[PDB]
Design a binder for this molecule. Structure first.
Ligand SMILES: O=P(O)(O)O[C@H]1[C@H](O)[C@@H](OP(=O)(O)O)[C@H](OP(=O)(O)O)[C@@H](OP(=O)(O)O)[C@H]1O
Length: 117
């Protein structure tokens, strides 16, 4: 129960709009249960933590590193209920991008092992 809701990684990033393709600052949190949740403002209490702006599930996701429109961009391709979606993120260094993509992959891998077991 409690290990599943551990926060694996959290931090600020920029998230690109889907239609108005600007880079928007968002605070994201990844948990062991595959939830990847974003906030406009970094939450400062539990009520704020419980009301994210963005909410994705990283189970079986694909993780793509790209250099356009900016270096150090990454794309997650994931399933949102029954629709495949892509979301685009940016951080300031390739090392930080690797930290995020590896963290997400590690969580996805743990979920697949749970399924197998
Ligand atoms: O603002 P524009 O460019 O019009 O497009 C919006 C933003 O990309 C939203 O992200 P953000 O909330 O981070 O601004 C996104 O929410 P999610 O990424 O949470 O899905 C919306 O998807 P919808 O969820 O389909 O509304 C999408 O339609």
């Amino acid at each position: 129960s409690m290990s599943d809701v551990a926060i694996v990684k959290e931090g600020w990033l920029h998230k690109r709009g889907e239609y108005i393709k600007t880079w928007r600052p968002r605070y994201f949190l990844l948990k062991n249960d595959g939830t990847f949740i974003g906030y406009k403002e970094r939450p400062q209490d539990v009520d704020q933590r419980e009301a994210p702006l963005n909410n994705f599930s990283v189970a079986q996701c694909q993780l793509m590193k790209t250099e356009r429109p900016r270096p150090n961009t990454f794309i997650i391709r994931c399933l949102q209920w029954t629709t495949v979606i892509e979301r685009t993120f940016h951080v300031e260094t390739p090392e930080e991008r690797e930290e995020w993509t590896t963290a997400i992959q590690t969580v996805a891998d743990g979920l697949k092992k749970q399924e197998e077991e």
